[PDB]
Amino acid sequence: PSEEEEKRRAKQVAKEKILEQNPSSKVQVRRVQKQGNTIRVELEITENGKKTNITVEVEKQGNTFTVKRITETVGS
């Protein structure tokens, strides 16, 4: 598949993953980056006076996009 098509799917897989773990939250995606079959999606959550930066690594295996690594940091 094309470059933009794969970034779009990986971002949505990543974002849906964050939405599930954070039900009462608004999730924005700030950057999507592709390196080979690995796509890195950076997301930010801002709720209850806290700011959490999230990095999720999505992997393309054949034509499935699976989350492999999630990193969260809470500030403020």
Helix, coil or strand: residue 11: helix
52 Cβ partners below 8 Å, 6+ apart?
44, 45, 46, 72, 73, 74, 75
Q: What's the gap between Cα 74 and its chain centre?
A: 16
Listing from the earlier edge strand, what are the strands of the sheet with 50-61? Answer: 27-35, 38-47, 50-61, 64-75
Resolution of the model in angstroms: 2.4
Distance CA 52, CA 44 (A): 6
CB 46 within 8 A of CB 25: no
Show the domains of the chain with their CATH numbers.
1-76 (3.10.450.630)
Q: Which residue, 21, 37, 17, is CA-closest to 29?
A: 17
Q: Which residue, 24, 16, 6, is CA-closest to 62?
A: 6
